[PDB]
DNA sequence: ATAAAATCACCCGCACAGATTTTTTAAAACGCGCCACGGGATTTTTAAACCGGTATTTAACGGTGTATGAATCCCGTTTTATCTTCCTTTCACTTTCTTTCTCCAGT
């Protein structure tokens, strides 16, 4: 849906683009997270979705 | 360049039918041993053949009235003879990669 010049000047020009470089911090945690999210089991994924999304959003700090 | 008509891959949960894969179990087998059973040589007893005779019990024979066996006509069942096929295989050809041989401009 974008014109080529817009795409160039917004994403592909090395002088005016911003990107992210992917790095790995801890190997143990990453494997567990990948297994939980992309694995065949359903219950751990549902529990993880419920904990982070349904909860942990009603922040009771107000500061 | 305008019209007419078509086709396929993946993501997300859940329930179930079907296809491997271990795991357990009952049957078959092997080695060793002993005593239950059958062979051989005497005693004993009884099953059946044999004479009677008598008293029944069966089968062959002569009428009636059916039930069935061989023949005919079909249609689903299984065999056998008869076509096409995909993987194995090499193999001559082609292509593509690697090393070598010069040219050759520059100093």
Swiss-Prot record:
When the enzyme transiently cleaves DNA a phosphotyrosine bond is formed between GyrA and DNA in an ATP-independent manner. In the presence of quinolones this intermediate can be trapped and is used as an indicator of drug toxicity. Heterotetramer, composed of two GyrA and two GyrB chains. In the heterotetramer, GyrA contains the active site tyrosine that forms a transient covalent intermediate with the DNA, while GyrB binds cofactors and catalyzes ATP hydrolysis. The gene is gyrB. It comes from the Bacteria. The chain holds residues 744 to 804 of 804 of the full protein. Belongs to the type II topoisomerase family. DNA gyrase negatively supercoils closed circular double-stranded DNA in an ATP-dependent manner to maintain chromosomes in an underwound state. This makes better substrates for topoisomerase 4 (ParC and ParE) which is the main enzyme that unlinks newly replicated chromosomes in E.coli. Gyrase catalyzes the interconversion of other topological isomers of double-stranded DNA rings, including catenanes. Relaxes negatively supercoiled DNA in an ATP-independent manner. This is DNA gyrase subunit B. Consists of 3 domains; the ATPase domain (residues 1-220), the transducer domain (221-392) and the toprim domain (393-804). ATP-binding is cooperative, and both subunits must be wild-type at residue 103 for supercoiling to occur. Non-hydrolyzable ATP analogs (and ATP-binding) induce dimerization and enhance ATPase activity. ATP hydrolysis induces domain shifts that are probably part of the mechanism of DNA cleavage and rejoining. Signal peptide: none annotated. It comes from Escherichia coli (strain K12). It is found in: Cytoplasm.
